[PDB]
Amino acid sequence: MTTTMKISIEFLEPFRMTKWQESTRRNKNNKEFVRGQAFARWHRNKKDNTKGRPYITGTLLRSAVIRSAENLLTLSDGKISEKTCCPGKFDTEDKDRLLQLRQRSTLRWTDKNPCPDNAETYCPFCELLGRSGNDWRFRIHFGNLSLPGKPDFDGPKAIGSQRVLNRVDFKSGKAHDFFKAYEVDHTRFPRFEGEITIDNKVSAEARKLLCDSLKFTDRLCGALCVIRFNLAEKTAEQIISILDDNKKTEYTRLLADAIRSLRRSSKLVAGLPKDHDGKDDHYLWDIGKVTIRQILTTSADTKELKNAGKWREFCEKLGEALYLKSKDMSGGLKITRRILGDAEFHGKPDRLEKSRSVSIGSVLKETVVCGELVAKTPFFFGAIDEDAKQTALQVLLTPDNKYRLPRSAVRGILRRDLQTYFDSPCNAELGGRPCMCKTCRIMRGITVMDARSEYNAPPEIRHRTRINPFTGTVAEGALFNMEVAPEGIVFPFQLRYRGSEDGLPDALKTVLKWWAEGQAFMSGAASTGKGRFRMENAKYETLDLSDENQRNDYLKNWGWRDEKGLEELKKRLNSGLPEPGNYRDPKWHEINVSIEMASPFINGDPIRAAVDKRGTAVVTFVKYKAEGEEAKPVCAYKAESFRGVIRSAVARIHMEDGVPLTELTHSDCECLLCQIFGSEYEAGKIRFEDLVFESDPEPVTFDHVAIDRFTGGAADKKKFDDSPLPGSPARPLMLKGSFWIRRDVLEDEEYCKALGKALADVNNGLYPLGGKSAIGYGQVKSLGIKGDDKRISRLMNPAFDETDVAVPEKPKTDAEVRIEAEKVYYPHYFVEPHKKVEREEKPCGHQKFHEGRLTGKIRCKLITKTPLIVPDTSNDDFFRPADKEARKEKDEYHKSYAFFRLHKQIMIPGSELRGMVSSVYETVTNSCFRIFDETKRLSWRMDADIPEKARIKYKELLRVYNNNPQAVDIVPVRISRTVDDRMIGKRMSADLRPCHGDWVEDGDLSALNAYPEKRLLLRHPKGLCPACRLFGTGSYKGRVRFGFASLENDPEWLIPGKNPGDPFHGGPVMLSLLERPRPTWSIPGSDNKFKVPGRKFYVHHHAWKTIKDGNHPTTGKAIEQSPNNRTVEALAGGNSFSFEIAFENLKEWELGLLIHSLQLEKGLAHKLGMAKSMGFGSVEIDVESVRLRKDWKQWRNGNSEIPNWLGKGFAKLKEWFRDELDFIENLKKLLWFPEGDQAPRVCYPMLRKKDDPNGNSGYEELKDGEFKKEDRQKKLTTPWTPWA
Amino acid sequence: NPIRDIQDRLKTAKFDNKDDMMNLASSLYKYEKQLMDSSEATLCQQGLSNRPNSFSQLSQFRDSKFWQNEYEACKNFQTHKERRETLEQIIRFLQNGAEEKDADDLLLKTLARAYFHRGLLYRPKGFSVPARKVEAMKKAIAYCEIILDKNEEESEALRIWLYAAMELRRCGEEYPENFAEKLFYLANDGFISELYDIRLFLEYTEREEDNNFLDMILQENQDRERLFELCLYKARACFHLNQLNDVRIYGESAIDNAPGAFADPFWDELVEFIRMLRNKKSELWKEIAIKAWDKCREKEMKVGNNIYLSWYWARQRELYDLAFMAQDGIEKKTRIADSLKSRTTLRIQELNELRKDAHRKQNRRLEDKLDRIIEQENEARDGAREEIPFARLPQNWIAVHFYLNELESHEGGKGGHALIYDPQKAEKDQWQDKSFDYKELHRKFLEWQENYILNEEGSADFLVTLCREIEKAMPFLFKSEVIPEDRPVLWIPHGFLHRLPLHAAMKSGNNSNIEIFWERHASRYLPAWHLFDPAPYSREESSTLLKNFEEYDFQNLENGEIEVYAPSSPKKVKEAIRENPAILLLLCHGEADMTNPFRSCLKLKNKDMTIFDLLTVEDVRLSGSRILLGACESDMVPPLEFSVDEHLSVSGAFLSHKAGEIVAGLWTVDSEKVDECYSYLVEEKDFLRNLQEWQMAETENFRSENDSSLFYKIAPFRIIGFPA
RNA sequence: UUGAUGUCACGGAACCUUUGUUGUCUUCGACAUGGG
Ligand SMILES: [Zn+2]
Ligand SMILES: [Zn+2]
Ligand SMILES: [Zn+2]
Ligand SMILES: [Zn+2]
Structure with missing residues (x-):
């Protein structure tokens, strides 16, 4: 007869469960089955179906109880209730029938031999083992433990989740094998219940030993324990159909990631960015004329998604659907995961292991x-x-x-x-x-x-x-x-x-x-x-x-x-x-990093730019910090990017037997980079954290615009605003953080040298941080290091300089212009280029500092010769009086601008200066037209005295009729438009078009947009021209960087200013109508002989005097306020700026012609800023010094070598063009600045003769003489040709 | 470069010819691959000429690859690193396509070869086979079975499937299913496409005795690069034909030409050939085993006159067991057994660790790590010391040489052997071969060892029980007919017997009359017989004590005629061993490295000193110096894993510098009796007799009540070396 | 849904390797329209 004891196990951690196995494989030869014996088991309710429930065997519980009993007996010196136990028995014949054998040592508390194997009076421990009593009868029996009520579930994945568990090599730091288990969460499934039953002859001392062993047992199935006695699918295909119908599936990946970003809060849907001018016409969310914006906002208001957990799930599923669609829009050439990440290895116990006994003691x-x-x-x-x-x-x-x-x-x-x-x-x-x-x-x-x-x-x-x-x-x-x-x-x-x-x-x-x-x-x-x-x-x-x-x-x-x-x-x-x-x-030291930047900074985040309300096209990275339940954002510089910068700084300056470390593959590799920064075969020894800004800066927007080299107007490129953190010389950005370096690296001088050299070059300013260094962002002023015990910073002492020779005088110009005081000139003329463009198929690589090429810095001063306008376009209502409070109802108004300032410091952006100098360098080298609207289609009015060609021409005619700002072959009306058969790109020589341009032939190139060789149709057969080799392309980084310019003196303003007590703000001037350029004027007609004339430049003249008097330049009547005019704050002549250009891997002739393009000659000047044709914007540049990198430790003065570089540049031009060099003298003749008593007028004609009180010809009369269609291009391509 | 090729394939191509279509398709693929790989080709910045025509023909081409990746890795004039890179590129480019709904055969067949060949190249990492390799072979099989499901006798898929299955057998896995069926189809295919196939027809012959293929194997032409393997296959074919004289000729020709690297599969196949001849109960295996052993003696000397290093091979122990069993002469048995001793075996992980330390010391032993050529020997697929006479033992001694034959033990026999040499007997009676079973002695050692690690002196009873097992396993130690009564004994142990106090074996006898071995004979130890090189003692008065042991003050050693340094640093250790002291005492701690013995180190005051450092000291002058060691000798030895483990330690480092004789403990020694024991030996510098006098003095105290705790303190000390 | 004189699985870090980078002056004068 027997009695029964109820038992339950309560788990305190997620417990582990093993896979189900077919009944044949449940044997000692199956490694996966034997390794899983310590885990819980899955019971298939019926063999061929996963439906089932978990359970725990009593054999497992007994094994744990026995281990507990040994421990309690050794503490009590083998006595239970003052009655003694022998060691027990743990060896059998026929070991093959046991599924497992004891590897561990059994404990001992006495040296006596165990009880005989056929005796009657067994000691308490032998009763617990079941040798007492020994069809089959049990002296103590352990039943299986099951969930209360035996519920069923459709499979293990309903109960838990299967997870990979590692094994990492200590020497390498990499895992070479792994195994898997199901982890089942205890909050969902806390308790299992079972029973123990006991025969009535079991002694009281055995019963005590059992109960204590149960309470002492603290683990089972890998967990600590106590033993007691649909919409997301519909929305996806809807959006996919919309994005396909509108033919914009190129954005599927971006939409998938941006929508998945909305998990954080449903409130983001109401804040999605709008178009410029604030309309719901954003290039992603307003696809579909319903819009994706409406689909999300209606999903957001749906009650089924008002729960935050369900919104999260909705976004996750919708993102996954859009992503799984998105892959098919591309060739899908590779699998991105790498090889044999599949090595499941199960440990094998040794059947042959030797039995042992150990005391341990009390x-x-x-x-x-x-x-x-x-x-x-x-x-x-x-x-x-x-x-x-x-x-x-x-x-x-x-x-x-x-x-x-x-x-x-x-x-x-x-x-x-x-x-x-x-x-x-x-x-x-x-x-x-x-x-x-x-x-x-x-x-x-x-x-x-x-x-x-x-x-x-x-x-x-x-x-x-x-x-x-x-x-x-x-x-x-x-x-x-x-x-x-x-x-x-x-x-x-x-x-x-x-x-x-x-x-x-x-x-x-x-x-x-x-x-x-x-x-x-x-x-x-x-x-x-x-x-x-x-x-x-x-x-x-x-x-x-x-x-x-x-x-x-x-x-x-x-x-x-x-x-x-x-x-x-x-x-x-x-x-x-x-x-x-x-x-x-x-084993690790903290090294503390301090970086100073006197320039704006951006570390881009495209997904945030899509989701954020601000709407600018590039925005900085921000990271979220948990504090309590809240998450709060912080601007930072990513650890990944900073690691990348330092890694390449080391790489570009070291070699492995004559090959730069940037050129290796680093597989099975043991070079300097792999020893420090790690490999796919071993862990690295340097760890980078995020850097953060102190004093908590706020972003600011800068707008940019590309200028068509032909027309001089904007080129209607895709918008490219950015929102950097603001920094300037008076207000540097201070970046702070730490990186951790292993102790055996600081102890090695060979690694300290490698890091010291690299950080020395970062400190020298050769490695800017973040994006858009080309236009002056991310310029490091200094890098400081602490915590190395000066083992690294000993190499970072400043290079200073070598010599103090002064820069040479710039040559006097030999250009001449015969101004005649009675005549009137045109505000601009075209430089006609040479027929030959010198192209190279393979540029200079960026992967090292090349020998025979120059790296360094140019420092410049810029001086205004004529009043300068550089507007702060962040606020176009600057001069409205304060008393006219809050007049804003989406009316349209007279716009008003201040001069560009950053932290209240007057400056010029580097993007302006790059474009200004680029235009001259493009002309001096006879490069291509870097920016040019080559897919524009011209049209002309008809004189009063189907193939898809006819359709595209007609729909061009339809749009130009509809979008006319002056309104109160197939043609709809008897006198009408003539539309060109050809794009404007076909009116230019094929070698002068951009090297990396737009498709301008017949047929839609979009047929190939899934395949990579499409990019070869868009590139010139012969490579890159000189300007694209220096200033770069979207497929090749450039080699020059332009910084911001800072005003040196206190400002001198054109108008004295509204408050006499404040010298840092100037007064307003009101300008005439700034109006669109007209290529139909200089390309007079449909005839094929009318090709593009050349590059536009504006001449130098003093009409700005008439404007500060308040009078219109052509007809001297007063200028009048209207929503089409502008008012601006302008600096006067005599203001001085300073700025710096960095350059890398230039040839001597490249640096010669760059200095030539900056410096020009005495008697010549540049044009910068707004309102060029009205006289404003004349500036001159002087080189203050040139500094050259010899190596990481030595920098030297280059002023004495400028005469040599200029010579080799002019030698290169003679080599290319062999004195057929007229395009340069035409350029210099438009850069000429009038001297002394000379005062050209200069202005555009009026639309009619009678509209002008001066009586000059005006356009309607001028077209009928001296500017007839046949003569007009010759007039406009001849500098300083008068029109009256 | 690649863009110009695309241009050519458009100037001359019409798509009513498939050669034009294919040559165009190939050029686009090679363009786009290295666009992904980010080579220098990414600086090619130009485009295509004749834009409208090129657009037309490209759009036509796309409106209307395994052939390439087949060609790569046919070139193999390159290192194992370069082979590994190209194979991985083949896998990651083709893995994306082979999983399509119905992939092509040549795509599947190319990828299967890449997985198989990449599997061969994995570097081992422990005592187990690397898991990546076994997975790679199973991947290779999986893609072949797609091809063989649609075509049951695709010869190349069949041969790749069989090659992978054999490697699984080499890894210790079981054969896949249908192995006999696939091998039968190969026997129906019926021809040797490559020499790598002949082993399959031999497998078929052994499984079915269908001898038809054996004539081809013997008839094969000899102008091959890996002839040593071909002779072994001819030897196996010639055995199945029962032509035993030519089996002998081919077998010896194979061994004579054998490769120098154990990574070559030849060495595994040779051992299986010997073991197959044995299980068929031929007599040829004895000769071939002995010849193979003689060839396997390939090794490196490190600095230090007596210390050697070797690369690990998993079946070397099995071969030495077989050669030992083959040889009948006891003198020649000893030379086989002696060849294992005083030699470290390392893996290509630890061999690189030594290469780094050699570089750090700027030592030209770095070039001896050209042994890493073994990494370039994994693929057969490509088809690419003085012997000390025993007569130098002085006649008043006895020498006992041990060997532990694991194979003979696991086959159920008495695998322990004690080869006893008596130099006074007639020339045919000098050697005895006494055999014993060490399984229970080994178990009682492990049982003591765990109790020692957890309790130190609490293990004394297990030590006492162990010392009786030495006598029970070896009764012949107490027979005058094997070890005559008075003569000193020289021990040359093997394996875990190095850890035992053989000099302290206990005979139970009558309950009042326990007897200990040291009461009968004096003793000395040598790690191996080839370290025997007697010389006189150093002719100096200097005695030096180097200490870094703050736990205790050695009041009897320190207050005497000794140059005592209470703290010490590695520079002082280096300096002292350049003065050739008469006696040098070194009393400090140490720690073991379980993975790499040479990186075990001594604890000095501010800087650890490794065994590698101690061996490589320049200008050492230590010949004939007597040396006594503290806890370092016991603590620099790991816990035992296998019965045949042997571990280097500081005593072996000093003996490499030709030290006279060395006193050290087998387990951690009580400082108070180190203080007494070493003082006595310093005062009376005849160590051999004075240590016995000390032990026989203290054994009187042991006999009073048989305190195991006292026996635990006086047993550990032993003498290593053999001076003149 | 365990089998009993033998379970160190709390015997095993999902580990290691990759700069959201590159290219762009917030610029600017000739018409509009259909008839007869
Ligand atoms: Zn009992
Ligand atoms: Zn490397
Ligand atoms: Zn260009
Ligand atoms: Zn360990």
Whole structure:
């Protein structure tokens, strides 16, 4: 007869479960089955279907109970209720019928032989083993444990999620194999229930030993335990159909990522950016004339998606759908994942292992440590879900979306840090008797708790790219993305150590001290700063389980494992960690970085630019910081980008047997980069965190516009605003942060030299930070380093200079112009180019500083010869009086601008100066027209005295009729428009068109937009002309950088200003109508002989005097306020600016013609800024010094070499054009500045003779003489030809 | 370069010819691949001429690759790193397409070869096979089975499938299913396409005795690059025909020409050939095993006169076991056993660690790490010391040589052997071969070792029990007919026997009369017989004590006629061994490195000193110096893993510098009795007798109550070396 | 839905490797219209 005991297990952590196996494979030869015996099992309800439920075997519970009983007997010296136990018996014949054999050593408490195998009076431990009693009858029986009520589920994936578990090589830092298990969350499935049944002859002492062993058992199935006695699918295909119908599926990827970004809040849908001028015509969201904007805003108002959890799920699914569609729009040439990431390896136990017995003794104590782990940087515990594929790298979350800090990762980093303390790796073999080394014995005592955050907002996405070292652009198809958890999250931390020494081992005291000091590097992606924690609020206590009174109190309370017990235990933990005896310094040093930038800064984020209300086309990266439940944004400079900059600075200046390190593949590689920065075969030894700005700056918008080289007007390019952080000489941006460097690197002088040289060149300003360095952003003024003990910064002393020779005098010009005071000239003329354009197929590569080529800086002063306008277009209502409060109703109004200022400092953007100098350099070298509206189609009025060709011409006619600003072959009306058969690109010589241009032939090139060789139809057969080689293209980074210009003196204004007490603001001048250029004037007709004339330049003259008097230049009547005029704040002549140009890998003839284009000659000047034709904008530039990089440590003065460079530039021009060099003298004759008594008028004609009180001809009369269609191009291409 | 090619394929191409179509398609593919790879070709900045015509023909082409990737990696005039890169590119370009709904055969067949060949190239990482390799072979099989499902006798897919299956067998996996069926189809295919196939027809012959193919194997032409393998295959074919004289001739010809690198599969196939002849109970295996052993003696000397290094090979131990069993002469058995001793075996991971340290010291042993040529020997697929006479032992001694034969043990026999040499007997009676079973002795050692690691002196009872197992396993140690009564014994152990106190073996006897071995004979130890090189002692008065051991004050050593340094640094250690002291005492801690013995180190005051550092010291003058060691010698040795493990330690480093004789402990020694013991030996510098006097003095205290705790303190000390 | 004299699986960090970069002057004068 028997009696029964009810049992239940309560799990405190996610427990592990093994895969189902067919009944034949459930045998000792199947490695996957044997390795899973310690886990929970899945019961298929019926063989051929996954429907089932989990369960735990009683055989597993018995094995744990026996292990507990051995431990309790050794503490009590083998006596239970003052009755004695023998060692037990653990060996059988016919070992082959056992599925598993004991690897571990059995404990001993006595030396006596065990009971005979056919006796009657067995001791209590032999009753628990079932040798007492020994169809089959059980003396104590353990049943299986099941979920209460035996519910069923359709499969394991309903219960839990399968997860990859690593094994990392200590020496390499890389994992070479892994295994998998299902993790089942305890909050969903806390309890399992079962029963134990006992025969009535079992002794009372055996019953006590059983109950104590159950209470002492603290783990099962890999978890700590206590034992007690649809819309997203519809919306996707809807959007896909809309995006296809409108023929804009090139944006599917961007839409997918931008919509997925809306997980953060439904309130973002109301804030999506609008078009310029503020209309709902944005190029993404207003596709569909319903718009995607309407589809999302109606999804947002839907009650089924008003719950934040359901909005998140909606966005995730819709993003996945759009992404899975988006791939088909491209060739799909490669799989992006890399090779054999599939090596599942299961440890094999050794059947042949030898039996052993060990004493351990009665001394046994348990130390509890409690605290928190606080994320000091973003962190990444990688867990990919194969059912989600939009993100390449994904982070581990609980089923209810709280962030998780796994048990498995905490153990893995303890074992790593213990091997670091002892400075001795383990060969971490699987199987066989336990490893007896000093680290493994500590880990065998340790216990840690799986933990989760309370914070549960969705992760951030960070995008990453790869740079093509030769071209300086992104590599083809290199974009990839990653999820990260925010910094500031707090996890509960609890560790327990059970062992024989008093308190913790000294190695563990030290490792916990490293964690408390802030060096708990715990997550993946460490090389880019992820996963650094500090252990905080630590408290500890030791329990003496050898004491019978404390042991029984420990058993009574289940060791205070559950939450009720734990709060009672935390009342009597001592504060602070114990100090170690043999303290050892940690393996990583913190190096502190300080960077100063006197220029704007941008580190772009395209997805944010799409979602953000601000609407500018490029915006800075911002990162979110968790504090409590809130997430707050911060502007930062990414760890990834900063790592990339420093890595390339080292790479470009080192070699591996004559090959630059930028040119290697770095696979199976052991070079200097791989030794420091790591490889795909080993971890790196330097870790970069994010840098952040102090004083909390705010973005500012800058607008830009491309200028057509023919017409001089805007080129209607795709809008390209940016929103950098503002910095200037009076208000530098201060970047601060740290990177961590391993101790064995600082101890190596060969690595300190490599880093020292690279950081020296960053400090020299050769490596700007972020984007748009071409126009003056990201200029580093200094880089400071602390914490190296001067082992790195000893190489970073400033290079200073070599010599103090002065710059030569610029030559006097030989240009001449015969002005006649009675005559009138035209405001602009065209330079007609030479027929030959010198092109090269393969430019200079960016991957190293080439020998025989120059790298350095030019410093310049700019001086105004004529009043200058450079407007601050951020506010076009500047001069409205304050008393006219808040007049704004979408009326239209007279616009008014201030001069450009940044932090209240008067400046000129570098984008202006680059374009101004580029235009002259393009002309001096006879380059192509870099900017040109080659797909424009001209038209003319008819004189009063079907093929798809006819359709495109007619629809051109229809639009020009509709969009006429002056309104009150197939033709709809008897006298009408004539539309050109050809694009305007066909009216220009094919060698003068842009090297990388638009498609201008017949047939739609969009047929090929999925295939990569399309780009070859758009490129010239012979390569890049000189200007595109120097200033660059969208496929090739340029070699010159232009900085902002700063005013030197206190301002001198054109008009004295409204407040006499303030010298820093000027008064308004009101301008005449600035109006569109007209190519129909200079290309007079449809005839093929009318080709494009040349490059427009505006002449120098003093009509600005008439305008400050308030009179119109042509007809001297007063200028009148209207919504078509502008008012502006203008600087006077005599103001002086300074600015700097950086250059890299130039030839001597390139630098010669660049200095020539800046400097020109005495008697010549440039045109800068607004209102050129009205006289404004004349400036002169003088070179102040040239400084050259010899190497990383030596810079030298280049002033003495300028005469040589100029000579070689002119020699190059003679080599190309062989004195057929007229286009230069025509240029210089338009750059000529009038001298002394000379005063050309200069102005446009009036529309009619009688409209002009001066009586000059006017256009209607001028077209009938001296500017007839046959003569007009010759007039306009001859500088200073008079029209009256 | 590539853009110009595309232009040519458009000047001359019409698509009613498939050669024009193919040559155009190839040019576009090679263009677009290196656009992804970011080569220098990305600086080619030009475009296509004749824009409207080029647009027309390209759009026609797209309105209307395995052929390329087949061609790459046919070139193999390049290193193993370069082979690895090209194979991986083939995989990551073709893996994307082979998973299509119905992929082409040549796409599948090319990718299968890339996975197979890439699998061969994986560098080992431990005692197990790398998991990446086994996965790669299973991937290769998977793609072949797509081709073989649609065509049951595609010869190339069949041969790739079989090649991968054989490698799985080499890795220790089981054969796949249908292995016999696929091998039968190969026997129906019926011809040797490459020499790499002949092993399949031999597998078929062995499984089915269908001898028809053996004539082809013998008839094959000899003008081949890897003839040593061909002779082994001819030898196997010639065995199945029962032509045993030519089996002998081909077998010896194969071994004589054998490759120098164990990574070549020849060495594994040779051992299986020997083991196959044995299990068929031929007599040829004995001769071939002995010849193979004689060839396997290939090694490196490190600095230090007596220390050697070798690369790891998994079946070397099996070959030496076979050669030992083949040889009948006891004197020649000893030379086989002696060949294993005092030699480290490292993997290509740790060989690189030594290469770095040699570089750090700017030492030309760095060039001896051309042994990493072994990495370029993985692929057969391409088809690419003085012997010390035993007569030098002085006649008043006895020498005992141990060998532990694991194969003979696991086959159930008595695999432990003690080869005893007596120099006084007639020339045919000098050698005895006494055999014993060490399984229970090994278990009792591991049982002591764990109790020692957890409790130190608490393990004394397990030590006492272990010392009785030495006698129970070796009763002949207490027989006068094997070890005559008075003569000193020289021990040359093997494996875990190095860890045992052989000099302290206990005979139980009558319950009142326990007897210990050191009461009968004096003892000395040598790691191996080839270290035997006697010399006189140093002719100096200097005695030096180097200490970094703050736990204790050696009041009897430090207050005497000694040059005492209480703290010490590696520079002082280096300096002292350049003065050739009469006696040198070194009392400090040390730590082991389980993975790489040479990186085990001594703990000096501010800087650790490795075994590598100690061996490589320049200008050392230490010949004939007597040396005594503290805890470092015991602590620089890891816990044992296998019965035949042997681990280098500081005692072996000093002996490489020709030190006279060395006193050290087998386990951690009590400082208070180090203080007494070493003082006595310093005062009376005849170590061999004075250590026995000390042990026989203390054994009187042991006999009073048989305290194991006292036996634990006096047993560990032993003498290593053999001076004149 | 376990099988019993033998389960160190708290025996195993999803780890390692990749600059959102590149190219663009916030510029500016000749018409409009259909008849007869
Ligand atoms: Zn019992
Ligand atoms: Zn270990
Ligand atoms: Zn490298
Ligand atoms: Zn160009």
